[PDB]
DNA sequence: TTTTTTTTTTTTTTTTTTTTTTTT
DNA sequence: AAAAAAAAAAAAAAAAAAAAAAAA
């Protein structure tokens, strides 16, 4: 027969929607109809495919060629449809045995020499192909991007002849290159209490507010914090890489498994810091996925932008919807905020500037003082690295909390929060007494319980103790 | 001569308007013409249908073909016009007996091998076909989506050969898979999670039992949002006839309902920064907004003082009528929006409050049946664990089911949707009740609509008390839920 | 087969994307198909190429032509695609040996007689071809514009026959004509102290602050401060030329191998001073790239634009976006600011309204005492031409500084400025009592250490000896 | 008094439909 | 002979200028 089927993937936003390239060589006169809502592949892929096939010592059908791309009601954007179309034409013309086209995808754009150039935003395609247990044969120019995954059964090719031989024959095509922290917690000299609070915050996945005078080192703590976080798992690292390449370029292989850290400037722009429209562009909120987001000088952020942060903090994703489409763009980040503890009624106005809806779901608050000149001038003779052991500790604590349930201590709800904390009478009377002394709100009490559970788990205690609650109180409260 | 008249459906908004594909072969040179305002997505079905016909071992006419997908005013958008066109071509080429197409509606998309593909937004077409008594034939990929309807006159096929064999000889096609029966026992939510907010928990229970809109006022931290979220569990499951109306909107806007919550009342909580186009109706080819997506469910408006007033002013029409006539200067769609409203507001963010107040629309707050002040939860009921945790959602849901069922006796409409033949009459106000109402009204400075929206609330309370008439104590309870602001 | 590849450039904004023109001659009927999102100006080059080849005593193929222009997803705008396409056609038709087209890059449109014509925005293409070490061949009309940069290995032709002759047998092809000011640092009046402060600032790359009565000086010394900095390399000169070209003017007479100097007036503009809008254009900040930015009367301007300078001051670039594109311009400069000693609370408010976060980044501060008649005896102070020796010393200083670590003293962090300053016990002893005298912030302390390291490294010292630290204490910040 | 922010209006931009000059 | 190259209109959104409401 003269009917062939091929597979590829079109990237809209962050998802790679599967496409089904269908070629049917009729018996009429030379034609190359390309039905399916292609925009720039319509009249351009035709000539590139023709020349690439001819120059690779192949017969180009002298027939009526009809190419139908995937779902009809789906615009198709990229230029990587030249390789699937060329292979479909060859299969339909019997120059390739089509019995071996079932399990393989194809992505790439063909030059006029038959060579394979490199398309953009390829890692999402690799993810989708591996998820479906399909071989993904890409151009050599994308070998660097594809090698991050190290997924087996993926290959790369130099030109079309290499792929045609890999299909007709079984020659190994190219495979992939095997797999082509510097700050450390130690640099934070003599802060003690704040460092320990940040350590337990990392261990519990809590969000922490850093209040202190200017030049106290808040930004340094935020920058060094990401060393605490455990190295991203393979799947999380691949998700981060996918969200990255949608924007272009990849200076990876030195940090590809270190959690992201974003510190948007307090001016920024709502569309940039939150999602993105037009062709869906992830915002600074989304590049922090599985990582840390540092909102420096929180009050100077406009409340309108901060109001949107309530969605991703609670859902783990942020969907931005336009008249055209709405995309997922996961935003499962960990928040860190910084703010000056006010300089009079000016203090009241300053605290009024801040967005209560966001500040009420920040699980922690630590006050930072300027350094002691004795420690500031003393040398960093205590150069022993320590972030390594703390990272292993955080891994252990997160594993415990996952063992309890899929929700970290930071994401427990009221019912599960009360069910997981033992909260015996011994601690209950003290808790009632303190609440009588200081009037915590409904959610402040549960934040206190969550932080107390984090501390208790850190100490390996099977149950929350009064000492743990007394410790958690110090890291509790908002503002003065 | 040979011409064929195949039927199909085109969706414009929520209604699937019938379309009559009309193929006609002439003896001229082998061209191919499509009329009837065919969009590009459907104007390129020419070669696709040609290939799907040739590959299925048929004879594609070498003749001047002329398709007429039109009532000439309606533009055709979907991609499901390939199966009707292919069958029309075959019937007009005498390869299919034209009497087989007597009362069938075909919806499908053809690949280049004849294999059928799944179109989107199929539920409205299935509903329309069922209402028209026509047989419907769809691609296998839509069998899962159309299984909810449970209509016995729908068939699914794998490729064009299957449909051709069915029409010519009737080889039974494939029927649709069984309806997805499931349970809801858990809900993972429960009415019990609300700890100690007893007074305001007994006011949502008589708003679920009377369709009354409810306004939640209170300081932050208290469980206004949590109570709103739990409210949906109170409402009874949706009657199939209503779950289909909701599933049509779900398919049109989103895709693939969950098959488990498809009979649970919807709960939508739009975020105040969302644009009016997303909240009310929609531009472009019209798409349901949040308001319509909450059809037959609960619309939770959090932070009522917020939201552009252009939106809150438009909610009067859905609350009175039940549908939003979104206009685009070319046509207006219906988009049913019969929802139950729940509001949340902060009574105080001096005389500066005048700026914060009046940002809302007074008539909207006048349309809200109830207002309950969520007091901050006290320490004794906050520290104390859930010593009592027996499930109440099931029992209360049974109560509301019974209360609704009884409520349809006098009038099917719920006591909230009851007019001045109900504020007077249905509410069998007695003499002593008349004097009590006279005294309280004269003492209280209330508008004329103030007198109304107690008779309905009092009737709801009486119905919960199984009293033939209001006993002068139900009115006493009702008064406590009226009033407004601080 | 009949298949030839040529190279050119496509200039958008400040970057000249590489484009690989690909030409294929098939056996079909006469035709001319372009590919790669070629605009009307590019896509109309068919007839121009045909006539230019025909009139140059060449043979235009009767076969079917098929030109594929570089990346398939990059629209092509410029009109300089006629020469690459003509050369590609000739190479594919065996009229030229295609080995010559290996490393050359061709630019410039073709008249209907075969004569070449100039094309706008040529400097970015020259820069890009320089970075890639590719022989660029341009129209003779563009020689008068390209040669000003003084870049070699670039040849200019008048007609297609000249280029064909050069490629076939290397017949000269002309060359960019030759490229066709004292400022005498010694001119500055007898300030001595401020001269030494400027010298250390240049040596270490520090940002310096100037104080004195309005118009009493500063600007006179600010102008000549640029003379001490080392001469720009060829690549840096071409970068500055490209930025000034996208601005839209570099005929003038600028000697591009010397550092620029920009002195925006304090009225300023939030768009011109930072970055251009509407059509992205370089702001005054980027025009100072690899130069000196002089912000006279710092208290002027506004408390927002000075915040946007925090990023480029350290990162070295400015990113301007309007949700439609992300445009990056280099902003590596050595900020020099000036301020009068304010015009009591009435005088405290003036310095209290300053941009504290940005001022904190200005390492140095000196006082310019006014002169009346002392310098009127010009001989014996102006008659030494002191610029050359200072520049030589600065070159050696930069070389040694970069040798110690890949960062100038002015861009070290709290880590290196302790591992490199290598203060012992007495050295660390002195600064403790100094800090006890004045408890400066951590940033001020590290600025002191950096200035002291600069001074020590000028004296061929192995460590930060006391004398150097005592000298560095001279400047500090003395806002009052 | 001695001084600044917030909100609205006008102008502008982008996208889509329309349109208007194409592609064959 | 058939659309896509284009000056126009509207939906929707954003920025700068301006009004003014507010505050030093
Ligand atoms: N342990 C430490 N505590 C505080 N500052 C430190 C410490 N170690 C080093 N520093 C230095 O202290 C300086 C303070 O800058 P930074 O850490 O950014 O504070 P900041 O609060 O972010 N700046 P600002 O927002 O204007 O107040 C940096 O230059 C650090 O290198
Ligand atoms: N019985 C209760 N009453 C009030 N709040 C509760 C109760 N039990 C738990 N909560 C808290 O309430 C949260 C959810 O409701 P809520 O505090 O109202 O969130 P919200 O979105 O901020 N609504 P609001 O309190 O009005 O701002 C839970 O996460 C708990 O922290
Ligand atoms: N004088 C009256 N006598 C009897 N019924 C009345 C009277 N005035 C109002 N109503 C009733 O009020 C109900 C609601 O109508 P109404 O409140 O007038 O609508 P509306 O005018 O759009 N609301 P508003 O904009 O606040 O005036 C009607 O169904 C009547 O029963």
Residue numbers in the entry:
A (entry chain D), C (entry chain E): 1 to 180, 187 to 349, 364 to 500
B (entry chain C): 1 to 349, 364 to 500
Reported in the publication:
Local refinements were also carried out on half of the hexamer and the Lon domain, resulting in an improvement in the quality of the map in these regions. The structure of ComM that is bound to dsDNA was obtained in the presence of the non-hydrolyzable ATP analog AMPPNP, which is located at the interface between two adjacent subunits. Taking the interface between chains C and D as a model, the adenosine nucleotide is coordinated by M226 and K195 of subunit C. The β-phosphate is surrounded by residues 221–225 of subunit C Walker A (residues 218–225). The γ-phosphate is coordinated by the side chains of K224 (lysine piston), T225, and E302 of subunit C. The catalytic glutamate, E302, in subunit C could coordinate a nucleophilic water molecule (not visible in our map) for ATP hydrolysis. In addition, the side chains of R316 (sensor 3 motif) and R463 (arginine finger) of subunit D are also involved in the coordination. In ComM, the H2i loop, which consists of residues 281 to 289, is half the size of its MCM counterpart and prevents the extended hydrophobic interaction along the DNA, instead making a potential contact via a hydrogen bond with Q284. A second region of the protein makes further contact potentially via R366, R369, and K373 residues. Based on the topological arrangement of the ATP-binding site relative to the DNA-binding loops, it is hypothesized that R316, which belongs to the sensor 3 motif, advances the CL1/Ps1β hairpin upon ATP binding.
